[PDB]
Amino acid sequence: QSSKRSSRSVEDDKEGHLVCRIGDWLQERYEIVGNLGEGTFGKVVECLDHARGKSQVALKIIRNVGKYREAARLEINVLKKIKEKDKENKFLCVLMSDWFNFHGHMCIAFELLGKNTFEFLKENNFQPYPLPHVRHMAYQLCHALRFLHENQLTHTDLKPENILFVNSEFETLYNEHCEEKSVKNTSIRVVDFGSATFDHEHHTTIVATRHYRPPEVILELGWAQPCDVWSIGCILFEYYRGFTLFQTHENREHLVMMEKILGPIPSHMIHRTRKQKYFYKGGLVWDENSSDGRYVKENCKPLKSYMLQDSLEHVQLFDLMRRMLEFDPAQRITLAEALLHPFFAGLTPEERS
């Protein structure tokens, strides 16, 4: 198709999605060449940026629906702040190259990245990342969100699907008659600032994906940057073991697993929560001898039990993870503090770049 003709021939479906396929253009500039993702928000497509010598971008095209348009405007405000504050592009938040309003569709152009860390784990038959990879990805997440936290921002939806490799090319360790895979370059970027909240802005009550959600959110006690620290702790567990720390889809059971894995919920948090129906006389309501009781009993053990090795680097990892999974968000380690944790003495100079 021709740039001008294609960019002006435009229509939406009954749901407010842009009708488009591979080959279509936007802004006499972006040529759609692949599909990367879709949701209720809209769609993400790979494009060639013909105004920047056909360099590759991920273009997010938001639905022509007021709720999603407004949310996208707020997302752009966050991305603009990140860009304003990271002139060397060294804080590892996804680079927004362009944004525009295409017939009511907010569109955001990003640098093109590789597979997300969940997809890579799944392609490795959920065999975990080796500890040095866990350590480098942890360092990068602490560095990226410390920067976001210094700028009165909280991501609120950190999960492995929102952490992408710059380049996900892998090496084969073994291929016996699942092919065992390690990523070559563990450089990552954080994506999807579509839930990211400034300190002064309205806070959505229930944030984060289930498995990465902290106790102060479940208990509706208010949340801020420590929410993201809890998420990171859960992510690092999952990188290290290949399975989620909290495999549950119900609040009371989730809070029970937290107490079995991490120790007792602080008294003051139970006193203050409106979620009183989960408690009786200050203790979580929980039948140990039911089927769910036996699953939790068998599967949810003290955090340290999940160590695969007893050496110093594993002990250091678990100390940092424990500090990231403090119940009380006011006692939870900050990412500025996390960057100084002795776990990160095991990095190399390349890994500090």
Ligand SMILES: CCN1/C(=C/C(C)=O)Sc2ccc(OC)cc21
């Ligand atoms: C589809 C994932 N995805 C995004 C998703 C959202 C909701 O923003 S943004 C993004 C940027 C680059 C990329 O490369 C592969 C992927 C990418």
